[PDB]
Design a protein around this nucleic acid. Structure first.
Lengths: 50, 50, 112
DNA sequence: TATCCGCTCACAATGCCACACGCGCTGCTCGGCCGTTATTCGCAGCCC
RNA sequence: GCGUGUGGC
């Protein structure tokens, strides 16, 4: 009862969050200076590192 | 006994003391001590009790 | 006084450190408290090849340093940004700047 | 000022054997080179 | 060259 089991989905979600925090840092340091009418929300995020 | 062994008895010195306990020195004047103490446990970003 | 405090960041990305710090100061509109990030670290010397004159014009020991007045809150701002590998200066956490002779020396280096 | 007492850090975790895989891209930063030294061919001693 | 994973005495 004091020992919890974590399957493939939980670890996958944990790794996805580990990637998502870096993606969030990137998009926040990019949006910190990104103003209006500059780009479409397709280049703010990075699909290759996640 | 836990209180009598506590060298600081107010809230202000307690914050800087616990920050010096956490961070390797670099004590703040009510600027980074309270913020780190609230971010380490009372922040949903770096604390995700499921 | 608008002191010339010295700090070392992550090498190689030192231009990235310069622009990140510049953007951070320009976001918090704290120009009356902080200054420049040593943009003069651009030695135009290069390897000038034939038929291709692409010149990066970058040669300096790095060490992105910011002209700043000593304050605890300002220190926390400049350490909250990434690339704070080393906040050099003889101290616990509150250093001292360098005299104006080295400022004139680096001004000469920029002149060259 | 001495005598232990308490907090902190280095150091150890068989021995082997077998199989498999896995070791990232891009923006600053630094040093620095001649067609007379190194490549290639003509010639001859020595073994088969 | 090591690391990781797995198995065996």
């Amino acid at each position: 009862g004091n020992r919890r089991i974590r399957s493939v989905g939980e670890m996958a979600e944990n790794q996805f969050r580990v990637g998502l925090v870096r993606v969030e840092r990137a998009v926040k340091e990019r949006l910190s200076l990104g103003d209006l009418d500059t780009l479409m929300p397709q280049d703010m995020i990075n699909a290759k590192p996640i | 006994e836990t209180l009598r062994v506590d060298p600081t008895n107010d809230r202000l010195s307690a914050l800087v003391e616990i920050y010096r306990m956490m961070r390797p020195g670099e004590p703040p004047t009510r600027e980074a001590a309270e913020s780190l103490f609230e971010n380490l446990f009372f922040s949903e970003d770096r604390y995700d009790l499921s | 006084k608008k002191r010339w405090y010295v700090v070392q960041a992550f090498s190689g990305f030192e231009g990235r450190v310069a622009t990140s710090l510049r953007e951070h100061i320009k976001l918090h509109n704290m120009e009356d408290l902080f200054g420049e990030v040593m943009v003069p670290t651009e030695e135009v010397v290069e390897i000038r090849g034939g038929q291709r004159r692409k010149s990066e014009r970058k040669f300096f020991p790095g060490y992105v340093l910011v002209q700043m007045v000593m304050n605890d809150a300002s220190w926390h701002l400049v350490r909250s940004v990434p690339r704070v590998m080393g906040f050099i200066g003889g101290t616990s956490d509150r250093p001292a700047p360098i005299s104006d002779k080295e400022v004139d020396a680096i001004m000469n280096r920029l002149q060259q």
